[PDB]
Structure formats: C-alpha cells, structure tokens
C-alpha cells in the first residue's frame, strides 16, 4: 500500500490517453485531454463564503466511509476524485474509500488504485447500475457515516467537517455540499451560487430553484446557515449509516441511472428525516450534457421505469400529475414494488400531500378537478398574459418554463385561467380579440373545450377556435375553426 503522493499518476493515466487526431469528448462526454493535463492534486480556488474560512471546525467527529461508484470513468478524473478526498479531509475522519467498479471495460482502472492507502476496490462481475453499486459499497462500509461522491469530483477546503457536524448532532439529517462546477470543456473549477435549492416539475426531473426573495431576506442574519431542500441532486451526500439501512437503503430494482435521487428525497422527508445543503461545504463536479454509457433497454425507458417505481410507492394520487406530464410513462412496465410498499408501511411515513404542503409548497399543484394544466404551447411559443390584467389582451411569448405569466389551467368549469382571470370571448365575429376578465362560472363567454386529440381549443357553443395569427398586431383572437397552424395548442399536463 502506497501513500497517495507516491502513486504513479503518469503511468496510470498514460496509456489511456487520447491518441493524436482522436475526438477528446467521445469516451466521456467531457474533454479528456484537458482532464489528463491536470495534476492529481491540482490547486483549486477556495469558493467558500468568508465566514466559513474563519470558522475552526470541531475535531471529535465520527469518521466516514466514502463510497464512489463508476462505469468507464476517465482515469485522470477518478484518480483526482480519490486524491481530493485524501488531501482535503482530516485523515482521522476518513476510515476508507470504497470504489465500486460497475463492470468497466478495463478492470485495471479500479484495480490499480487499490494500491493507494485507504482505498478498497469492489468489482461487479456484471453491470448493476448506480443504485445497486452504491448499496454494495454501503454494505461493505466499516464507519458509522456514509459519504457518496460521483467519480469526477474535486473536494474543496474543509468540505467534510461541516457535513459531519450536522449528522453527528442529528442522525436523521441527510446533507449535501454546495456543488461547484468543473467545466466539461476546459476543466476550470467554478464557484456555484449559494442561493439555490433542489426541486422538480411534474415530469419528476431534478432542477435547481432560486430561494424566494423572502427566504433570502430571512437568512441575512446568518448567510451560511443550512438550507432545507425538497430534493438533493443525488450524487453528493452524507448520511448516518444505520439511518441509511433503517430507511431501506435504495430500491434495488432501479437500473443504471435516474430516479433514485427522487425516491430517497421523498422517503427521507416523508419518513421523518430532513435534507440539507450546507454552504460551508464545497465540492466540484463535472457536469455534462450527455451520458457516455449505455442504458440496456434504452435510456428513456429505464428512466421512466425507475421514476414509476418511485412515484407508485411514494406519491399517492399525485402520481397522476406525473402521468399527465409524461403520458408515455403509463406504458412502461415497472416490476414488483411490494417490498417498497411494505417498507413504507413499516416506517409509518406521512402522505405525499404532507410533503407538498410542508416541504415543497412552492411546487404549483393543479386543482384535483382541473382538466388540464401548465403552459399552453404552440411550437416554441406559449400563451402569455404579457403582464396584463382584467380587460387586457393576451399574447404569445417564447416558452421559458418559469411559470408566472405562462401558467394556465383548464378548469372543471371549462375556463382557461390564470390566477382569477379567464380568457373571455367578448365578441364572436371572426377575427375579434379576446380579453382577460375575472372568472365567473355563469359566463358562457369564458367556456372552452379541447378538440382533435387535445390539440386545439374551441369556444363552447361555436365554431370558433383560439388563434394566434394576430398575436403581434393586437393579441390572440377567435377565428373560425380550420386547418391553420395558428390554432394549435397543447397543455403540458393533460389530466
């Protein structure tokens, strides 16, 4: 066994290098030439708030076992992740680093690192995916606290102590650093915003949300306080090992990638723990735009399968809002969920409604009797109030997926509404502009219905359809229904 600085980086990385004239992005979907130029312990900027930099971090903390799974990772990036852990962590707080080689083409990527102090390598003899690989690493762990990292990360100064402190005080906290960005093209290390929380839309795809102006204001007193998050990104977190086991690890029937971050976030919150982001902890990650590896069965179907398994166990009736956003998911078989259901029963977990109301209230939820909801799209344009109020015209604007003036519902009363304003047919002569007015159930001018496979909107009791052809010369209008592209409209959720 060899101390990390004695490891022969040049030999290890040499001989998987990008050959002359080859594409430096093909194998990893990041620039391997730039990754390979970097020293295994390259210096990176300290991106922490000033207040963190002054704190002196407590000493008697439990050690952690670090689990890193990988499938065909670039040698330079894998080695660098391991050395940043060793170099930036107090040595007594690292019990071990467990590398789970998830059936990489070349077993030597992992096995050669087994020489390094504190490194243990486990090789899957077939492809298992990240969920089963993480569970195998956790099972092998000897410490009281687990730490998970992706195989292309770089820990910053005093990254670990702030995370361990939270969980030593209360083992039901599952905590995450702020994830800095390692640029996929040039490998520069870039400090991320600390004003973000994890979230998702009804398609159940992870996204970053800014804190509200009010949340921000209430932290002005302690700007590096923990941030409660509805959802963790998934790959970088710290969790009490007995807690991880008691809550049921991960769903072992999830495959490859996707959905497990959603499942564990829902499970932790609903079953009595919490999820935090800790601003004094900073770890960089190579964010990329494409997966470099295969998905047996196709990536769209695997992602959907995994997500169904989460939605069917945790979301109660709200799962229907996911199926309304992604109707093609209803056709994807998802297997047996009985042991997950029994887990939920055994833990006495709160219902999903409680999660929505108490953990993620800012997620906009449709009324239970809405016919359709979300944005109303025509190509890459969306129905938009333009900031107008009652008596104002309505228009289209490029879809931006940020809600506000592009948020609509088709109600049980057949009205197309935003807040308490409704699209109103003020004049039935073809070519007339429509107007926003206060919604009244008894106003027949405000009644609309979806036609032609939920692809158009017709004013009830007429042959008039909602039409955008006059959008830049006045606003949306009503025109006789016909084969015009300017009459095509689709809600993002159809119930």
């Amino acid at each position: 066994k060899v101390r990390w600085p004695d490891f022969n980086q040049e030999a290890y990385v040499g001989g998987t290098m990008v050959r002359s004239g080859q594409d430096p992005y093909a194998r990893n979907k990041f620039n391997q030439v730039e990754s390979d130029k970097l020293r295994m312990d390259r210096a990176i900027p300290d991106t922490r708030h000033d207040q963190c930099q002054r704190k002196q971090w407590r000493v008697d903390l439990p050690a952690t076992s670090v689990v890193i799974t990988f499938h065909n990772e670039a040698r330079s990036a894998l080695l660098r992740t391991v050395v940043s852990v060793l170099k930036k962590s107090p040595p007594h707080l690292i019990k071990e680093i467990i590398l789970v080689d998830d059936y990489s083409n070349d077993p030597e990527d992992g096995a050669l690192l087994g020489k390094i102090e504190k490194v243990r390598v486990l090789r899957n003899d077939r492809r298992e995916g990240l969920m089963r690989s993480r569970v195998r690493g956790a099972d092998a762990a000897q410490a009281k606290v687990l730490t998970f990292l992706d195989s292309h990360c770089e820990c910053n100064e005093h990254w670990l102590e702030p995370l361990l402190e939270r969980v030593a005080e209360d083992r039901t906290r599952v905590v995450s650093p702020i994830i800095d960005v390692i640029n996929m093209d040039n490998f520069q290390y870039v400090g991320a915003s600390a004003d973000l929380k994890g979230g998702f839309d009804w398609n159940l795809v992870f996204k970053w949300d800014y804190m509200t102006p009010e949340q921000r204001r209430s932290r002005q007193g302690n700007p590096v306080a923990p941030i409660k998050t509805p959802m963790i990104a998934g790959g970088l977190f710290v969790m009490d090992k007995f807690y991880f086991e008691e809550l049921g690890k991960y769903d072992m029937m999830m495959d490859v990638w996707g959905g497990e971050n959603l499942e564990i976030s829902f499970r932790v919150w609903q079953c009595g723990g919490s999820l935090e982001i800790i601003p004094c902890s900073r770890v960089g990650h190579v964010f990329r735009k494409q997966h470099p590896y295969t998905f047996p069965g196709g990536s769209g179907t695997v992602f959907a399968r995994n997500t169904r398994r989460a939605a069917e166990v945790w979301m109660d009736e709200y799962k229907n809002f996911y199926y309304a956003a992604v109707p093609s998911a209803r056709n994807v078989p998802y297997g047996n969920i009985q042991s997950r259901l029994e887990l939920r029963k055994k833990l006495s977990c709160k219902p999903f409604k409680w999660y929505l109301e108490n953990v993620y209230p800012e997620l906009r939820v449709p009324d239970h009797q809405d016919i359709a909801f979300g944005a109303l799209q025509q190509g890459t344009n969306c129905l938009d109030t333009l900031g107008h109020f009652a008596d104002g015209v309505v228009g289209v604007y490029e879809c931006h997926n940020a809600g506000g003036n592009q948020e609509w519902a088709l109600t049980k009363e057949k009205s197309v509404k935003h807040m308490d304003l409704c699209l109103t047919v003020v004049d039935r002569a073809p070519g007339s502009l429509i107007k926003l007015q206060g919604c009244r159930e008894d106003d027949s001018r405000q009644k609309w219905e979806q036609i032609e496979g939920n692809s158009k909107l017709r004013h009830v009791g007429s042959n008039l359809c909602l039409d955008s052809r006059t959008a830049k010369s006045g606003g949306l209008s009503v025109e006789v229904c016909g084969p015009a592209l300017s009459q095509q409209w689709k809600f993002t959720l159809n119930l």
Binding site: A192, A233, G235
Partner: peptide
C-alpha cells in the same frame, strides 16, 4: 443529463 448550479 444532470444540470449545473
């Protein structure tokens, strides 16, 4: 397919 902070 994960998006950056």
């Amino acid at each position: 397919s994960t998006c950056p902070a």
